Every structure is written in C-alpha cells, then in structure tokens.
Symmetry: C2
C-alpha cells in the first residue's frame, strides 16, 4: 500500500467515511470512480505501468506480444510480501484465493495460453480478477494488448482492427481515465496510444500521456519539449517513466529496486533534475489521486442539497420520535462531515 | 562516392557504358524518424540530406543520379550548380520551408535534384516523409492518409525496390514500413528490410531472430544498420567515421560478430548492387535476339552484293559493328 497515490490511506479513509455517512441517512452513493485503462502500441510498457500503479508485481511482461487478452482487474476494499489480509481471486476459478502475487502472474499466463495458445493468438474474452485488500479502493484497472500493424503467428489479416475494437470498447465510456502509453524512444507523432485517445477523447479531459523507456533514448535527446506542452499538448499533461528493462525482467528484479532506480535516474540526468518532482511513477500516481479526489468532491454539491431538503422535510414533520431525532442528529453530522 | 561494392561500383558503370555502346528506383518507407534519409544518403555515400529527430523530411525528394564524363541541379533553381553538398542540404531545407512553412507542414510536391558524377548510374532514388499517427503543427486531421498516399504513389510501381526501414528499438509487429511494403509487395520479391537504431536497443535484446527469418520473413531478408545519432548529427560527424563506427559496433557486439559480413550499410549496398545487376542481365535476351536478326539480314544483303559500292560498304561496317557488339555481350 503506497502512500500518495491511488492506494493512499487518506483517500481510502475518506471513501469509507463518506460511504458510511450515506448509508446512515438513507442516501444513495454517488461516488462513481472511473476505471483506469492503459492503451498504446505493442510492447510500449503498459503492463509495467499498471503494475507500478498497483505496487506489486502480478502482470506478465516481456518483449513481443505478452498480453493477448484483456485483464480487467477489480480492486476491492476489505476491512481486515505475501500478506494475509490481501489476496486475489479469479472468476474462472471461484473459491480459490491467491495470496502469492507471483502465483497470480503465473495463473494469468496459464489462463491466457489455455485460451489463445502459445503462438501470439489474441482474444477479447477478458480475464476477470478481484484483489481484496484493506489498503485499496473499489477501483477498476484494465490491462490490454498493444496495437500492432503486421500480423504474426496465428493472427489474422485484420489483427489491427480487432485490437483497436477491443481497446475502444474499454476507453469509449466517458467515465474512463486513459493512460496513453508511448515509448520515449519513438517520435510522439507515431503514438498509437495518443491516436486512439484523441479518437475517443478529443478534448483531453481524461487522457494522461505516459512516456516510457526514457532511459533508452538516443544520447543527447530528451522529452523536455513534450512535458512543456510544445509538441502535442495534453490538458492533463505528460509523465515520464522508467520501468524494468528486459534484463531486469529476466532477472526477476523486484519492484522496489526498480522504483529506486527510476528515482536515481531522474535525480541524475541534467534535463529532469529541475522538474524531478514531476517525473516517475509517483507523479503519475499523484495525478490519478488528484483526479479521483476531484471525482469524489464533485459529488458534494448535490449531496449537500439533498441533505438540506431531507432536513427541512424532517424538521417540518416534527418510538418514531426517538428514531427521527437520532436521524436529525445523524443528518447534521453528515452535513458537518461533508464540509470537512 | 565512387564506393566499390554497391550501387556506384565502377565495374558496374563500365558494364552499363559497354552495353549502350530501365533500372528500378529505390524508395524508403517507414515510420517517422525511423532513419530513412540516413540510410539513403549512406547508400549514395555523401552527406546531403537533412536529418534529425522530429519531422525533418516534409516533401518527397526525387534524386536522379546521372552518369557524365568530363554537381547538383534543382528544378526550382535552374542553372545553379552545387559542388558543395552542404549547400545541397541547406537548399533542400530552404525549398521545403518555402512551401510548407516551418511548423511541420507537409506536401507531396517533390523537390527534384540531379547529381552529375562520372562514378554514378542513371538511377532514381526517392526520400519521403515518415508515416505518422497524430497531426502536429499545421498538419490536418488526415495527415496519416496524405502521407500514406504520398508514399503509395512511389512504391506502387513494379519497378521499385522498397527499403522498409524499421527502428530496431520497436517491436517488428508495429512496423509501418513492413505493413505498407506487404500492402504493395505481398510476395516480397522487391522489399528489403532495414533495421535501424540497433545501437539503442534495450540491453539483452537483439535482432538475431529477425535476421534469421523467424518473426516476419522477407524473401530478400533483413539488414541491420547503425546510422549517426542526434549527438553525431550536432557535431557534423563525417561519414567515414560513422561508417567505421558501424563496422566496429557489428565487429564487437557478441550477437553479430560471427555474421559481421551480413550487417551494416555495406551489405545493404551489396544487396542493391546484386538486384541492379540482375535487372541489367535480364535485358540480355532481347538484345541478343535483335543483334542476331540484324546480322542475318545484313549478311544476306552482303551475300547478294555506285549505289552497290556505298551499300556494300555500309553492310560490311554494320556486320563488323554487330559482331563487335555481340562479342561485348560475351
Ligand atoms: N528500459 C526500459 N524498458 C522498458 C520500459 N518500459 C517497458 N520496457 C520494456 O518493454 C518491454 C515490454 O514491456 P511491457 O510492460 O510488457 O509492455 P506491454 O506489452 O505494452 O504490456 C519489456 O522488455 C520491458 O522491459 C522502460 O521504462 N525502460
Ligand atoms: N543512434 C542512432 N540514431 C539513429 C539511427 N538511425 C537514426 N537515428 C536517429 O534518428 C533520428 C531521425 O533520423 P532520420 O534519418 O532523420 O529519420 P527520418 O525522419 O526517417 O528521415 C536522428 O536523431 C538520427 O540520429 C541509428 O542507427 N542509431
Ligand atoms: F505484451 Al503487450 F502490449 F505487447 F501487453
Ligand atoms: F524527418 Al522523417 F521520416 F521524420 F524524414
Ligand atoms: Mg502487457
Ligand atoms: Mg528523412
Ligand atoms: Na510486449
Ligand atoms: Na525525423
């Protein structure tokens, strides 16, 4: 559970408090948090980014096509590094609990291979995963295969159309935050992630550009012009990232060492020092945290109005008396908490 | 620029000159900033193409090599000769900017350049902008379609060798060059894959599987190359040092030593030279047939024989000339 992001203890406490408040005054819950979806070209580093957001390794990563089926991860808050209060469970394996996240990765691989073989095949049938933990939100993440241009192995001629439709079904909804993942060692104008995001989200009200592989850029080049909004501007801006390379994947490098390595990388290069606070996985997590806090606080006006109307009605109305006065006190406490 | 073992091989030029006494054009296709201009200029052997990150090439450049025995000429600047190739590069930049501004605009209107040298062939090369996905600057929403059509106009012809340029630091299945080449040349009988930026690949990864033909096979195969990075461009590094650097890179990397002879710009030049020689030797059947028929006709006439005198002379001269030509062929 990493502080200052989407698993922020403060944010989880806030959501739980507000949920209990609403469930103590007969008011339906309006908190409809968006799902976070990664979209981009093949091997652009989407699974790496998503697992970095989660904070524990559990997604299959590697060169070529690795993710070949949508993985719909369902974070589940559960009142109480193989922990016991935390685990994952698959829908196609009901009843089974996965406390070892390495076993979750292994099961994702096995389930994928069992349905799309081991020859680059693809399927839109999602792998549904629930992760229970007392330190997460009721949030939905989505990992997707990367878009390609030339088919390989069992792939049909229209593989691009299939992958594109598979992604569009997940990013077409207005309540979805699009992580458009682009490799930094590629010109930004070639980004499939930005292309698709702009296709669904032209106004950029829910698209975050994530520039991966910045440690693999040609010597003397940087992404500073993009961050400043000088090439292809994004309302929500860009975030550079340094995930684990292929050598690190083969060596099963832990996530913590990789995050420290990213921190050092951005603290040492002359082009990113002056803006190091705006670099790395932590800043992407902070952007997502701010967006979620925005979505929560945007529901405070109508809730205040509803509570005011209910209080006016109940006060005009006044075992029934005791319950009603308790409800009046509860409504006032609810208004107070909605204020803080 | 008179480099042996490529498209400017002196023996090949001598052969062409012998034969006279319709080569295909070479077109580069690939994603933006994939290194197409670098590959093309290395094939030619002299620096004269604008290079750099972002969008640099924004208009087709139709370079026409012309053999001449004792410089550059632009269509929009008639009469001016460019002996200094740096000025050729500057003029390409200026002419591009004169029609598409300086904000990434693009146009299919080509810049026509002729380079005369006694060490070149009568050949046509074409440099093109790279395909993109998102518009930039003044570019319209359909910039991708416009660039795609601009390229198709040049690679749809059957007499075109397609250098499909793919950066090696990108998965091959994302290659725009291969997609387009297969779109026009599905049988791959005239497509050569060129893998650039091999010096920027993630540690532990290589293109050994691609060269071996295990991912996306190409009849004519793949060639890895190491062009000048942006740091080299800024320092105006000469071509000789850059090519030596490519040679050393492939002579030292653990994955390519055992096959260094099949890597680099020299090997791509050798491939193109063999393709051109094939196209030349493909013109030998009809020439032999025509010479044989002409010889039969003239020999019949001579056997038959003031007009008779100056016709017998003509026929004997034509017989000698046809025999000399038929021997040149052999
Ligand atoms: N060096 C480096 N390699 C990266 C980075 N991000 C991704 N990669 C590599 O990119 C390849 C594909 O990564 P992955 O996360 O599986 O991409 P996906 O196919 O889009 O899910 C792997 O070899 C990763 O090591 C990065 O920031 N730096
Ligand atoms: N290090 C390195 N950089 C390369 C290589 N090939 C291309 N580049 C860089 O890629 C960028 C764009 O190159 P360019 O030839 O102009 O590509 P074009 O837009 O397709 O014509 C420049 O910064 C080049 O230095 C290569 O093999 N190695
Ligand atoms: F393995 Al991928 F996009 F190439 F998840
Ligand atoms: F400058 Al380019 F393809 F990006 F020639
Ligand atoms: Mg993946
Ligand atoms: Mg170019
Ligand atoms: Na991949
Ligand atoms: Na470029």
């Amino acid at each position: 559970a990493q502080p200052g992001g989407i698993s922020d203890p403060n944010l989880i406490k806030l959501v739980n408090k507000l949920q209990d408040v609403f469930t103590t005054v007969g008011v339906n819950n309006p908190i409809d948090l968006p799902q976070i979806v990664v979209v981009g070209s093949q091997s652009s580093g989407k699974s790496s980014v998503l697992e970095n957001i989660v904070g524990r390794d559990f997604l299959p990563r590697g060169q070529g096509i690795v993710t070949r089926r949508p993985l719909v991860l369902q974070l589940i808050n559960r009142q109480s590094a193989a922990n016991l209060d935390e685990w994952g469970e698959f829908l196609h394996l009901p009843g089974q609990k996965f406390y070892d996240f390495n076993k979750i990765r292994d099961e994702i691989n096995r389930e994928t291979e069992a349905k799309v073989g081991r020859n680059a095949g693809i399927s839109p049938a999602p792998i549904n995963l629930r992760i229970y933990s007392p330190h997460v939100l009721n949030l939905t993440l989505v990992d997707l295969p990367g878009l390609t241009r030339v088919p390989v192995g069992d792939q049909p001629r229209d593989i691009e159309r299939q992958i594109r439709d598979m992604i569009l079904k997940y990013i077409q909804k207005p309540n979805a935050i699009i992580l458009a993942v682009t490799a930094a060692n590629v010109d930004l104008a070639n980004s499939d992630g930005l292309k698709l995001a702009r296709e669904v989200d032209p106004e950029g009200q829910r698209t975050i550009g994530v520039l991966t592989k910045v440690d693999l850029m040609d010597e003397g080049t940087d992404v500073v012009d993009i961050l400043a909004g000088r090439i292809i501007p994004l309302r929500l801006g860009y975030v550079p990232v340094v995930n684990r390379g292929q050598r690190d994947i083969d060596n099963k490098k832990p996530i913590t060492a990789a995050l420290e390595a990213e921190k050092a990388f951005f603290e040492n290069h002359k082009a990113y020092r002056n803006k190091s606070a705006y670099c790395g996985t932590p800043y992407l997590a902070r952007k997502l945290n701010l967006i979620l806090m925005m979505h929560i606080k945007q529901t405070l006006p109508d809730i205040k109005q509803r509570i005011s109307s209910s209080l006016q009605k109940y006060q005009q109305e006044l075992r029934r008396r005791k319950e009603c006065q308790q409800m009046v006190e509860s409504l006032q406490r609810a208004a107070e908490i909605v204020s803080q």
